[PDB]
Amino acid sequence: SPGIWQLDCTHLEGKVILVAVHVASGYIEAEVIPAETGQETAYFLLKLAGRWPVKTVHTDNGSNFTSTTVKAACWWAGIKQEDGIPYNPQSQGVIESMNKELKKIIGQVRDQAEHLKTAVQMAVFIHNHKRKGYSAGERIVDIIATDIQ
């Protein structure tokens, strides 16, 4: 579980917010893209895997699962590309709740930036630093350090 991430795509303001969640910690990375293509998703994963030890990614839909560009990025970065089928039905709910929380935070910061991308990074910061007590950013570091040790 230290290496398991889940992709998630949500929409706001006619744009797409692509999110990666570290399953065990709830820590997130996100970016704003005009639309979700295999190429965008591939690039996002390359970025993520250079920053954290990404072992497995549960893809957000069947098009990204199928995408040869996404498969090429996962090959390149040594990531096991998996489906995102919620065999544990609780997964759907957690993701839904996370998207609603993220959108809430984006609304709370929306007037502090002209561009949606800025508001999204502000939301990422707030989400990752929120003590719920440890923050998600604290949990991910502890989890991975324990793994190295």
Place this chain on the structure above:
Amino acid sequence: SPGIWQLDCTHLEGKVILVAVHVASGYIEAEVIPAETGQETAYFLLKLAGRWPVKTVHTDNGSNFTSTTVKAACWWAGIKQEDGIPYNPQSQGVIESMNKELKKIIGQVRDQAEHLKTAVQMAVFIHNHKRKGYSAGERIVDIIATDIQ
């Protein structure tokens, strides 16, 4: 120590590569931008600070030190903005060598992507995973985890 980062700007293919180095570990984050403006630097720091516990940033030049947009991002993210004067003369050398290493890696991957941005992310990945023994990505996690405990 666990919270100090150094900004660094280097050029390739008529584009700018903006880099943040975690001083204690040598772990890096980087992005390709058309030119180094206060706004680009501010957005980059916002991204970085949402992902790692950024306490202090040594800015890469006086323009980014002066930039009110950069100061506004440092205020927003709770970062102490500092100069990057190399009071320790070893700093210039270390940065220079890192830029040289990064450009070498980018050359080694350059034909595996059409776009420079992709090559740069591949280079970040290789740099952060390289065992020197531990990798920089291992070092940063251990340093921050030790700090949390």
